[PDB]
């Protein structure tokens, strides 16, 4: 891995691979000029005399006035540490790279006046594997995780390194640094951004897209495990109804589960009786969903790439504009956008476990297991499932509607983004376990039709679990095995199965 | 008015003139080759004995069996009775007809094996003004709706006509009809639809683009009111960014405003203070609400032109196959995606009625009356907007996350699209509303400027105003005036003032 | 009917007795000393010439200033006008007649320092049924909706007599009234309160207990239909777990089915299969709910005698003081309680009708209808029973959590209460449709069991339906049937079965 | 400590005893009768060969097949091995305790048949302070949690002893037990039951009284710091509203802050002007909020002590009946009950918090820190508050109105309690750092006072923070100081200082 970054080209495959796994960036040498220019027109600002809110002046009262070019740089430290006010749990790693890489990418776009040095600074952090506290809370939609991410470029706050809290003077000696100062328009440019919104909305996207993939596997087992159709797959429905994400949806199922397999040929009259929703609707539902994480990616594949400070500057005219980039309000959408397709994506699974275990329904024995009398099988795992699918309703509330006045009702309307994005994690683990669930009970299911074949993807889906859990034959602790479940899908044991060009960042 | 209806091509334009007016619509003579050949490959099957699920079979039990040709026509009949089980109040003629006209197109494609007379008689029905009774609740997601609908064809239920309801076998005579009976595959085709799910977000749409429409002149004339800055609304921050919505936006108020303005060009240094984020941030909030209402009208503008019935007849190749393409999940989702974009239309507006009202921050008289120690003038007004805003966050929580299991378990998941639709009609008044009363605020304040104009087009949507709603001079009855503006703003005398191709229907 | 009002000790009994028909009341002897004693210590404050906030001063700028007495009767009247900024269709006159008696009632404690007189001109007004127009938005928890009430005893806004709208000063004629002027102290008393919010609820309240009543007797006679225990029911359980809406419903069932019936005594062993928690868990459900309704019942029956509005006038020690007692905040939690047990009362219902329609659990044809491969019954009634109860979910989301800063920030938290009662309205709709249809299905199951009868009160039960609503033969229109059903229980059919002591207001 | 139990008698405070620290528990005498009696009556049942569901025969098929006593027992293992099928982190020993505890309490009343010797198993393992793993997940509303925690009495599973986890085996010893053996009836009695649902909500009802607590010494801070009145305490007004909730609230801070203190001396005239309703209005919200806080605990009080297991032994009847006391619908509203109250007194919170940062009301410096042209101060914090406060928005959709059908339909409706409670744990943690932020700033502001001091209590309150966090002089890094604060009223802080008999468990 070696990122040699175009600055505001970052593409969603970019940002899933900077979110998975460490990176070694660059600045592409077609970013200097933009960038230089940039200061050079807030350098050209102070060498006139000239006043420019947000450059050179204070706040509040001060607004209009050039504070004097010798406290105009304590000014920058202040911003910075009264601004990280951040509270609750430390983001994991992942999650402070991908901000620092978006921070990296929009100032890196030249608009904003700061230091190509202070950009340098922040790459060689994520270089050397050095990653700044920040607090899950208190950005309304960034100052207070941006500021405390800032913080440790002046040598204050704190960093993670080989999983250890280092001191930032430390944490600065691993990636060949010392503390820096900053100057006009740097706290500024540094505090000011929606990366951390879109960060949060990005780990959402990434979830989502893996549940949708995982969705399709193990939509395409229960199909097989009860004895269903593939005729709701045909390509002729779906492009009858023209709904795009539809047709793809039903494209990835006719891929997995191909024209027919040893078990569906061993059901003579496959016909005779019609196929509930939770299956014969896979495409229509898990369609939606599509369409809609899709809609979501558009929107913050462009942020990620967006100049989101304030306020910019336009060297090439040589004006600075005050405008409001910093407001996230197509990310909080995005976000919410994202917990429909992610709740949907569970209930519609839910549904699936619950015909699986439906002796009326599944071709199979009352909770999958044999001699019922005396063992309850899957019977309380289906249980588990409509917890976790239930959590999901309430979660998806949208935060994107709820705004509080603040600083003094001059920041009058905010997004709420960060609380948007962050509980789409907590419902991909929910609809997670959902899927972890109705895998096992599909794998269970097709066991229990001895002998017989799926076809060869969604073989090599039973083959992956069947590594991890065995076949149930009696009752036993069920919990280890849809942990064990849980760890295969958040690995991406199932990924790899759908087919090319599908999702937006894979 | 003479639509000659290529069948799936109806266009947003074409959709938005059927549910503001009575249409005139005729087949177009391309359309009758699959219509037809989709009847004789039903007739081929029913002549050469042989079975179809769908086709000529019964339900439950003999949902395999070729019930009798004698009583296959009764069991149309039966269907249709049956299923009308709708509840709840009347849907008004325009949406009736929107429906009305959604199921022609959609039988017209020719996939669905009903008879050309049978979609003429709908066509005759439309032509004619004569609207059958639709109540409003019952669908989960659109067998109620679409058979009360079709109860008028058989000569039962009942029809409106010049606005009042006709029995079923006057209001056929008005159109020129006499009762019909229905052949095979005809009750489902005719109840198997997402046409009143789809009709209803339609509505929401429609309703939600006037009101973005409105907001970007109401939002032009608060920021003249207040003195605000146009440098927000500068072309090279917003493609900064590379939010599509946010260009478009931002592009908007710039052609409403103009460069500057009589009123604008009075403040001689307009830089003094930052304007606060329920001005300054407008391109972001509303672009985002464009983006919103933009993701949704493609997933409703392909569904309005959708094959949405079931089973499908594939008359090129002989084949008819059980699919689900009546789950309406799409547009439930299309639908609780506008609720996002009308509730956030209507906070922003909010939020500037309140600037409006405070002295701190207006440059106008508090509550803007003179003489504010014996008047309160807009200060009640303002309390009524922040009740209809608040109302809509609860109103925002999503159907397309519920879901209940129907019909003995068979219909395992819906969407419950209707539900959806329906909330944003309400949530489009409350936003109406709030939007009234910020046209009412800024006029006022405006008018306080003594003297001095906006910009061509912000006068013009000043003089509609001033045409009905007099300066506010002292306290009076100030009811009377919202009721005016709201009413004003639901003939759309704002709509015209935005630019050409913006808004998805317009 | 002639209520001698005692105020502040109205009971929950004479609150439905008021909303649900006509009254004529007079003030009872004893509250005419506090309230003429509370006019004397007003005038007798202008009489010195002293000071005090809300009595004799302005507002704003004139806050602490004493107003002219020869324009304080002029800021009188320049409140009613100006506060009269409500929005939506009118209240219906039951909705009117209630407010009208609560603002009488906290007026009457005398406790607000208005005339004597001018609460007799409101009793006027409801003694000769003549209801003042009220709009149904604008209040955040009441100004708009009783400034707009207030109106008519001015000479100004309008008001309904014999379900027609008449002009103001008609309409006080028929009262034997004319034109009023308000003194110090009268615009804030009539427009300070929490009367619209409380009546609103106190409706809300009304329909839940109508619901509860309607579902034990519907419940009862679905227990009936697929033959399940009465064992559930059981003193001794309900007595074990110590919760008492649970032992009061549960005490409920045992009075509605008796120890045994015809149908009961005709299932040998009964024992052999467990009933479904639709059935068996309806005391836990049902009395979670009952308990909710009663909490609720509680805040809102000491709101309607509560003395809302403020400054606050104590006689007996000459003090004015102003507090907050018009916060409908404990009104908006209890209508946000309500809609808990509103949604939970027509789940269960909901369910019900689900097992009804299951012929591997009801023990009845699918979906109750006799020869099923041609007819579908109740099929598509269940449907519309699932879409009314999902409707409720979203419903429920809480509005006592949302508030927007009004009048400049000086309102800087409110309520919501308005909105939070308004809801309930429609839920209860929602709820009673289900209840309806599972009524109507109840006894169409119950008729299969030909010849056999339930307990006495059950029996009732199904006469009143049977007197409108015949067993369902063979497929006909449902919609009708379902029309019918839900008008009886709007009229209270079902509940005089329920015994005495219950619910609160019954 | 040591806890004599006399099941079924457990108070409030007793429960908020054992959430917070280890106990001691033993036996009272006195429940030894109806235990061995219980146990006896099931006994006499097996001697019998008589048949019972849930005592002595199997399920599903073999429901009223009296299932062999050789493998009666291997059944009791089944259920426990099969029903542990929970999901996410594991619960904290407190709460695993509280759980314990409920279920030892209510099998002691001696209606389960579950030996005595099985009941101490759990009491050893209560006084060796050895807790069973239970992981977050999986109830429905308790078989998972019970199971998990069950397991251990088996010997499987793991357990927590001095923060490590232990093998089950090794834990028993720690608690002087070896692996037991099931008998007839105490795999369901420890599977069945609500404590898992019971314990989530009282942990969520101790931290709202916790809050509440924090709330009236926070806003007694606050109304000193901006010098507001006292006047909207006066006991008169709260008296004449008549709401209890109100009543008491007002009576806390008219203790708190005394009828003068030196700072509020300091304002000659007071009066002046009205104080904001975050201030005024004190009183009636947070009465609100103690109502409910209120009715949830009375709920939860009784479910405590409640016998929620099945079926059921009466040994003075010689019966066992099924019914469904394990249906934890009322802990599930009572769980919501408790969400609006935390929500509330949160978004009261940082309506206070605003105030204080307004200069044009809080009569304190801008943003609460002294020359503010150069430093932000408290102006960011604020920001946090806000996200704080607007997360609990979405939180408080209800969970009480969700439902899905599990175990084949015979499970159709189920409470989704423990997602109901759970959710209040995360409410809790937000309206903590609200009230941080809102005590840090009223400290704040009264240290601009020079040198003057409130109350005698508020004074304690000021000192307990000053203790840990210092006078803000000039900006700082702002996190730690929060940090600090949220951590002082985790540990209770601020409890102490409210009166005697408030609250329901202090």
Same mark, same amino acid.
């Given at each position: 891995?070696?990122?040699?970054?175009?600055?505001?080209?970052?593409?969603?495959?970019?940002?899933?691979?900077?979110?998975?796994?460490?990176?070694?960036?660059?600045?592409?040498?077609?970013?200097?000029?933009?960038?230089?220019?940039?200061?050079?027109?807030?350098?050209?600002?102070?060498?006139?005399?000239?006043?420019?809110?947000?450059?050179?002046?204070?706040?509040?009262?001060?607004?209009?006035?050039?504070?004097?070019?010798?406290?105009?740089?304590?000014?920058?430290?202040?911003?910075?540490?009264?601004?990280?006010?951040?509270?609750?749990?430390?983001?994991?790693?992942?999650?402070?790279?991908?901000?620092?890489?978006?921070?990296?990418?929009?100032?890196?776009?030249?608009?904003?006046?700061?230091?190509?040095?202070?950009? #340098?600074?922040?790459?060689?952090?994520?270089?050397?594997?050095?990653?700044?506290?920040?607090?899950?809370?208190?950005?309304?939609? #960034?100052?207070?995780?941006?500021?405390?991410?800032?913080?440790?470029? /002046?040598?204050?706050?704190?960093?993670?390194?080989?999983?250890?809290?280092?001191?930032?003077?430390?944490?600065?000696?691993?990636?060949?640094?010392?503390?820096?100062?900053?100057?006009?328009?740097?706290?500024?440019?540094?505090?000011?951004?929606?990366?951390?919104?879109?960060?949060?909305?990005?780990?959402?996207?990434?979830?989502?897209?893996?549940?949708?993939?995982?969705?399709?596997?193990?939509?395409?087992?229960?199909?097989?495990?009860? /004895?269903?159709?593939?005729?709701?797959?045909?390509?002729?429905?779906?492009?009858?109804?023209?709904?795009?994400?539809?047709?793809?949806?039903?494209?990835?199922?006719?891929?997995?589960?191909?024209?027919?397999?040893?078990?569906?040929?061993?059901?003579?009259?496959?016909?005779?009786?019609?196929?509930?929703?939770?299956?014969?609707?896979?495409?229509?539902?898990?369609?939606?969903?599509?369409?809609?994480?899709?809609?979501?990616?558009?929107?913050?594949?462009?942020?990620?790439?967006?100049?989101? #400070?304030?306020?910019?500057?336009?060297?090439?005219?040589?004006?600075?504009?005050?405008?409001?980039?910093?407001?996230?309000?197509?990310?909080?959408?995005?976000?919410?956008?994202?917990?429909?397709?992610?709740?949907?994506?569970?209930?519609?699974?839910?549904?699936?476990?619950?015909?699986?275990?439906?002796?009326?329904?599944?071709?199979?024995?009352?909770?999958?297991?044999?001699?019922?009398?005396?063992?309850?099988?899957?019977?309380?795992?289906?249980?588990?499932?409509?917890?976790?699918?239930?959590?999901?309703?309430?979660?998806?509330?949208?935060?994107?509607?709820?705004?509080?006045?603040?600083?003094?009702?001059?920041?009058?309307?905010?997004?709420?983004?960060?609380?948007?994005?962050?509980?789409?994690?907590?419902?991909?683990?929910?609809?997670?376990?959902?899927?972890?669930?109705?895998?096992?009970?599909?794998?269970?299911?097709?066991? /229990?039709?001895?002998?017989?074949?799926?076809?060869?993807?969604?073989?090599?889906?039973?083959?992956?679990?069947?590594?991890?859990?065995?076949?149930?034959?009696?009752?036993?602790?069920?919990?280890?095995?849809?942990?064990?479940?849980?760890?295969?899908?958040?690995?991406?044991?199932?990924?790899?199965?759908?087919?090319?060009?599908?999702?937006?960042?894979?």
């Amino acid at each position: 891995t070696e990122l040699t970054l175009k600055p505001g080209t970052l593409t969603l495959a970019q940002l899933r691979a900077i979110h998975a796994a460490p990176v070694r960036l660059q600045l592409d040498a077609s970013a200097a000029p933009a960038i230089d220019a940039s200061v050079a027109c807030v350098e050209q600002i102070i060498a006139e005399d000239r006043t420019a809110y947000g450059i050179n002046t204070g706040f509040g009262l001060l607004a209009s006035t050039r504070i004097a070019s010798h406290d105009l740089e304590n000014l920058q430290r202040s911003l910075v540490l009264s601004h990280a006010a951040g509270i609750g749990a430390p983001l994991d790693d992942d999650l402070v790279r991908l901000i620092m890489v978006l921070k990296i990418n929009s100032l890196s776009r030249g608009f904003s006046g700061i230091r190509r040095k202070v950009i #340098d600074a922040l790459i060689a952090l994520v270089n050397a594997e050095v990653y700044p506290h920040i607090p899950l809370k208190g950005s309304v939609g #960034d100052l207070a995780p941006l500021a405390h991410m800032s913080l440790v470029l /002046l040598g204050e706050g704190k960093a993670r390194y080989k999983g250890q809290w280092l001191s930032a003077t430390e944490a600065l000696a691993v990636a060949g640094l010392e503390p820096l100062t900053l100057a006009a328009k740097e706290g500024l440019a540094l505090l000011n951004g929606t990366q951390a919104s879109t960060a949060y909305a990005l780990r959402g996207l990434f979830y989502a897209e893996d549940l949708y993939a995982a969705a399709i596997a193990c939509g395409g087992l229960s199909v097989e495990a009860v /004895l269903g159709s593939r005729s709701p797959f045909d390509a002729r429905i779906h492009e009858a109804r023209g709904q795009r994400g539809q047709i793809d949806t039903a494209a990835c199922f006719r891929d997995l589960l191909g024209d027919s397999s040893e078990v569906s040929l061993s059901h003579k009259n496959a016909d005779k009786v019609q196929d509930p929703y939770s299956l014969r609707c896979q495409p229509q539902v898990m369609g939606a969903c599509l369409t809609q994480l899709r809609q979501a990616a558009e929107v913050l594949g462009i942020e990620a790439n967006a100049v989101s #400070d304030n306020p910019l500057v336009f060297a090439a005219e040589g004006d600075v504009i005050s405008g409001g980039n910093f407001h996230a309000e197509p990310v909080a959408m995005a976000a919410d956008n994202l917990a429909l397709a992610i709740a949907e994506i569970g209930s519609l699974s839910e549904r699936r476990i619950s015909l699986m275990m439906d002796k009326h329904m599944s071709q199979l024995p009352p909770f999958l297991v044999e001699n019922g009398g005396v063992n309850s099988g899957f019977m309380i795992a289906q249980v588990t499932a409509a917890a976790l699918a239930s959590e999901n309703k309430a979660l998806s509330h949208p935060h994107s509607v709820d705004s509080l006045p603040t600083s003094a009702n001059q920041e009058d309307h905010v997004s709420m983004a960060p609380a948007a994005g962050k509980r789409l994690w907590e419902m991909a683990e929910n609809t997670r376990g959902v899927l972890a669930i109705e895998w096992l009970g599909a794998c269970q299911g097709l066991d /229990l039709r001895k002998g017989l074949k799926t076809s060869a993807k969604l073989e090599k889906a039973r083959q992956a679990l069947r590594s991890e859990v065995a076949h149930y034959d009696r009752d036993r602790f069920f919990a280890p095995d849809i942990e064990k479940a849980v760890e295969l899908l958040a690995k991406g044991s199932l990924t790899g199965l759908l087919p090319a060009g599908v999702l937006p960042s894979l």
